[PDB]
Amino acid sequence: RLVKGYLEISQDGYGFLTENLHNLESRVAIVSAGLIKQYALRAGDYVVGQARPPRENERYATLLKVEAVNNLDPEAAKNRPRFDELTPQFPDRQIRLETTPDELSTRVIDLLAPIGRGQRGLIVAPPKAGKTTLLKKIANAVLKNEPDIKVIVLLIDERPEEVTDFRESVQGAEVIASTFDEPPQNHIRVAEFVHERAKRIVEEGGHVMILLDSITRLARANNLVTPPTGRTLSGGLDSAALYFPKRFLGAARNIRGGGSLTILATALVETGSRMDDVIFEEFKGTGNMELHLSRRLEERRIFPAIDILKSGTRREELLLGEEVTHKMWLLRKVLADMDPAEAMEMLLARLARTKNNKEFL
């Protein structure tokens, strides 16, 4: 009998193998501390192994033998550089964007913010600005441009029917979701489990995409979970709550020894709460990529409703050639001085004629 799951090591030295729901389930498989020490297994490690029905007085199946860890033969787990000791460097492998149903979005993103491997990016938009739809387009583009990259879609505290829509429209990539009906406890648990899985995969030199809608809601759950920390930060935030979201996002990095962790998350702003603004400014100092969306552009029904002037990445030269670098610099200079909605309107009109490369030509 074969069982599979993702390792979750408890406090007692033994662990369980989880399902896609990322929660304790009746079918989880027991993993003894002996096996964990035997294979240097770590939280989030994907374990596949033959198991047996539980004996009498046993409520969960026990993993008799470990077969594959993170899809590989487990000796390599013993002698590998730990994810935490991997050298972080800047995103050195740009990732072109193109999605057929709306490739305006992909070309505009590419012209506004290049994506590499190890990207620590954020999209900052008010509610109802295509934020979620842009995330969908990016997911589709990645699953066409980088099929090799494990694309993980994490949805925290968001709308269930949107969860269904992405699950259906992601063409099978790992969609982990926890709707707003769930308490922040569920959100934090699922997010951390997915995060650990991603770090374990990257520890195997893997390139991982995490499309995290509502990182702000994740921070909200973190604050709701932070037990006191004492004083209150301006806006209602807690001083020690944002440490966990900060670490969570900062995990995204490029590795010199193989693999990359790229987390692209969606940020809410212009929400009337100092809390949201403080979270945004706190995360911007950690991220390498920002794309700002304008509420007014959406109000005019101009899509993608991007605020071009505020958008950009850091170290684009590492993701773009000199010709492309000068092209983008020219484009920003031309558009820098002038109004947002008009900017998107003529950018769309000019890019609509042809693909971006010819739009240059």
133 binds, among Mg ion, a second copy, ligand ADP, none (CB under 5 to 8 A by kind): ligand ADP
Per-residue binder mask for Mg ion (CB under 5 A), 76-95, x = binder: --------------------
Per-residue binder mask for ligand ADP (CB under 6 A), 292-331, x = binder: -----------xx---------xx----------------
Indicate which single residue of 26, 57, 79, 234 sits in contact with a second copy (rule: CB under 8 A): 234
In whole angstroms, the minimum distance from the beta carbon of 57 to a second copy comes to 27
Q: Which letter does DSSP use for residue 314 in this model?
A: S
Is 40 near a second copy (CB under 8 A)?
Answer: no
Angle of helix 243-250 versus helix 184-203 axis, rounded to 10: 30
Is 179 near ligand ADP (CB under 6 A)?
Answer: no
Is 262 near Mg ion (CB under 5 A)?
Answer: no
**Chain centroid offset of residue 190 CA:** 13
303 binds, among Mg ion, ligand ADP, a second copy, none (CB under 5 to 8 A by kind): ligand ADP
Is 132 near Mg ion (CB under 5 A)?
Answer: yes
**H-type helices in 155-242, by residue range?**
160-169, 184-203, 215-225
Indicate which single residue of 58, 73, 281, 339 sits in contact with a second copy (rule: CB under 8 A): 281
Q: What is the DSSP string of 184-204?
A: HHHHHHHHHHHHHHHHHHHHT
Is 181 near a second copy (CB under 8 A)?
Answer: yes
Task: Mark 40-74 as b/e (b = at least 16 C-beta within 10 Å).
Answer: bbbbbbbbbbebeeeeeeeebbbbeebeebbeeeb
Count of residues engaged in binding a second copy, rule: CB under 8 A:
52
Q: For residue 268, give both structure tokens.
A: 């809410």
Binding site for ligand BEF (CB under 6 A): 127-128, 131-132, 268, 285
User: Euclidean distance between the first and final Cα of the chain, in Å?
Assistant: 60
Q: Is 129 annotated as a binding residue?
A: yes
Q: Where are the beta strands (DSSP E) in 80-167?
A: 88-89, 120-125, 150-156
Q: Are 187 and 130 in contact, with CB atoms under 8 Å apart?
A: no
- Cα–Cα distance measured from residue 179 to residue 159, given in angstroms and rounded to the nearest whole number: 6
Residues that bind ligand ADP (CB under 6 A): 102, 125, 127-133, 303-304, 314-315
Residues marked as binding for ATP? 116-121, 128-133, 159
